[PDB]
Symmetry: C2
Subunit: 321 residues, 2 copies
C-alpha cells in the first residue's frame, strides 16, 4: 500500500511548552495555532514486501540516524494499530526556504500520520489522526485540522487531540516571519521543554493557561485583533520567561529578536495592527490582519539584522494527494 | 541655623532583587533582597535646618534640583519632621561622584545619606536598624545602603518589620562589580512605576514565594565565599525579575540588544573558566560580578563589546557614615 499527504506547519498563538507524559506527548497545557498556507511538507509512504527496516528520504537526500528512528518509532505505532507488520519507505519533501530555521516537525508528522495510515488501509477520523500525529510530535496534532486550531490537552491518550476552531477563511490574518540573518543551532524543543520543570515559574504559567486560551479562542471567534495581539505577545513572553528561568537557562532570543519585539509593539501603539510571537528560536512571527501585511513587511525588512521576511496566510488541513 | 550634619552613602548592587511593593507608601517589599555596597561611588549630603526656611531647598551637584526631586526629598523630610517632633525646613546640599549620563541609580545612596544627615542634623541618634527603616521610606533599596558591606533587607509585612542588616563586612570577600554602561537613546520607565505593575504578572506570586530559597543560597554563599553558587543564583534571580517585568501588563522590556550580548558572553566566559556572573536592574546596564583577581580580565573583555560605552569598576563599600 502507498499514499501521499501534505500538511502545513503552524504558528502557536498560545504555546505548548512542557509535557505531562513524555512518551504519549500529552501536554501540560492547551494550545492554539494557525496553519501557514504557503509552507508545506509532502510525504509518501510505501509499505513493502519483506522489507525488514524502514528507511527515510528527506528532500531527495538520505536521512540521518535520529530522524530515521523518530520516523520508525512512529511507524511502529501505526503497525500495532493496523494489526500489520510491514515496514516502509518514507519520502518527504518540503518547500521551506533553506537556512530559515522553520521547524518542520509539526508538518512532518501530520503528513506522515495521514500518509502512513492511509497507505496501510485505515480511514482514521481527523480526531484520531490528530491523536496519532501527537505521538510523533506534540505540535503535529495541530496541523491535522485546518485553519485556526485548538489542542485540547487532556490527561489521557484518548483525550489529547486538536480540532479546528474556525476555517482559514474565517479571518484574513497573515504571519510575517522575520528570519534572522545570524542564528546558530539552538537546543531542540523536545530537549528544551523537558527542562521546563526546573523553572520556578512553570507551574504558575501552566495554571494560568485556561485564562489565556479563553481570551484567544474568543478573539478568533469574534475577529478581535487587539485582544489577540496583546494575548499572543503576553503568551510568547510567558513561555520565554520559563525558558530563560530554566536550569540551565534557555535563551532563544537573539539581540535582533529584541529589536523586533519592541518595534512591533511600537507599531501597533501608533496605529498599525500587528503583534509578535516567538517559538523555540530567534525568528519573530508578526501576525497582522492581511490588509496591513505589506506595511508590516516593509517595516520589518528595514530592521538591521533581518535577513528576510516570509509571508504566510491561514492554511488548510492535512490532505491526501 | 538650627542644626547641621553631613553624611555619605554608597549605592548597592542587589544579588537577590527587590521588585514589587506590598505597601506603596511605606515601601514594604513583597520579598527580601541581598546587596553589596559599591565603594567607589558616593553621595555626600549636607542637611542644614534653618529657622527662616518655610520650604525645603535641594541643591544637586551645585544646581537647584528639579521639581520632582525636591518633592521626593521634601516628603521624606516630613517623615523626619514627624519622627523628631520638630517643624524646621532645611537646606539640602548634595553631591556625588557618579559618571554623568551613565544611568546608574543614585536613589539608594541618596536617601541613605539623607536619612543619616537629616536625623543627625535634627538632633536624633538613631540605631542602624531604625535608620534603615527611615531610609526605606524614601527609597526601598536605600535601606540596604545604611548598613555596610553585604546587606540583607528583611522584607516583613509591617513598617517595623522591614529593615536591613549587614550580613558581612566589605572586607569579608574581595568581589568586584564591573558595570557595563550601554549607549542608548531610551529613557527607561522608573523602577517605582515599573514595579507597581508587578502584580499584573501571572508569574510574580511564584517568584515571590520562591525568594527565601534564593536568599538562603546567596546568604550562605557569601559566608562561604562560594562564587559559583553565588554566580548561578544571581543570574537566575536577575532572570526571574526580568521574567516578571516582561510578563507584566503592559510589559517592561528593560534589556537592550547589547544587554543580551553581554549576558550570553558572561555565561560563556564563566563556563570557559573565567569566574564572573551578570545581574541587571531596571535598565540595560549589565553588572558583572567577579572575584577581584579577575576584574581586569573581565573589564578587558567587556570594553571591546560593541555598544558598551564604558565600564566602571567597583569593590565592596562600607556603611553610610557621618563625617
Ligand atoms: C515552541 C513550540 O513551537 C513548541 C514546539 O514543540 P514540539 O511540537 O516541537 O515538541 P515535541 O512534542 O517534543 O515534538 C511552541 C508551540 O508550537 O506550541
Ligand atoms: C530594580 C532594583 O534596582 C530595585 C530598585 O528599586 P527602588 O529602590 O529604586 O524602588 P523605590 O522603592 O520605588 O524607590 C533591584 C534592587 O536593587 O533590588
Amino acid at each position: 500500500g502507498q499514499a501521499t499527504a501534505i500538511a502545513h506547519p503552524n504558528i502557536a498563538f498560545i504555546k505548548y511548552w512542557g509535557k505531562r507524559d513524555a512518551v504519549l506527548r500529552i501536554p501540560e497545557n492547551g494550545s492554539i495555532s494557525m496553519n501557514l498556507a504557503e509552507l508545506t511538507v509532502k510525504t509518501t509512504v510505501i509499505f513493502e514486501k519483506h522489507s525488514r527496516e524502514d528507511t527515510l528520504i528527506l528532500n531527495g537526500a538520505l536521512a540521518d540516524e535520529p530522524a530515521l528512528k523518530r520516523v520508525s518509532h512512529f511507524l511502529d505505532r501505526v503497525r500495532e494499530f493496523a494489526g500489520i507488520s510491514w515496514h516502509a519507505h518514507v519520502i518527504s519533501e518540503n518547500n521551506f526556504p533553506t537556512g530559515a530555521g522553520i521547524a518542520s516537525s509539526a508538518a512532518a508528522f501530520a503528513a506522515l500520520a495521514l500518509a502512513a495510515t492511509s497507505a496501510i488501509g485505515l480511514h482514521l477520523s481527523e480526531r484520531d489522526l490528530s491523536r496519532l500525529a501527537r505521538k510523533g510530535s506534540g505540535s503535529a496534532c495541530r496541523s491535522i485540522p485546518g485553519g485556526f486550531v485548538e489542542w485540547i490537552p487532556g490527561e489521557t491518550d484518548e483525550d489529547s487531540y486538536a480540532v479546528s476552531i474556525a476555517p482559514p477563511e474565517h479571518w484574513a490574518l497573515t504571519d510575517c516571519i522575520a528570519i534572522l540573518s545570524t542564528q546558530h543551532k539552538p537546543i531542540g524543543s523536545t530537549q528544551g521543554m523537558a527542562l521546563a520543570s526546573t523553572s520556578p515559574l512553570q507551574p504558575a504559567r501552566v495554571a494560568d493557561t485556561p485564562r489565556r486560551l479563553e481570551i484567544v479562542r474568543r478573539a478568533i471567534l469574534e475577529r478581535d485583533f487587539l485582544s489577540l495581539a496583546e494575548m499572543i505577545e503576553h503568551d510568547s513572553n510567558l513561555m520565554h520567561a520559563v525558558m530563560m528561568t530554566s536550569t540551565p537557562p534557555l535563551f532563544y532570543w537573539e539581540p535582533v529578536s529584541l529589536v523586533i519585539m519592541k518595534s512591533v509593539r511600537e507599531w501597533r501603539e501608533s496605529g498599525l495592527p500587528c503583534a509578535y510571537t516567538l517559538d523555540a528560536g530567534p525568528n519573530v512571527h508578526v501576525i497582522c490582519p492581511s490588509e496591513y501585511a505589506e506595511e508590516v513587511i516593509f517595516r520589518l525588512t528595514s530592521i538591521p539584522g533581518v535577513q528576510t521576511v516570509l509571508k504566510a496566510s491561514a492554511g488548510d488541513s492535512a490532505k491526501l494527494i
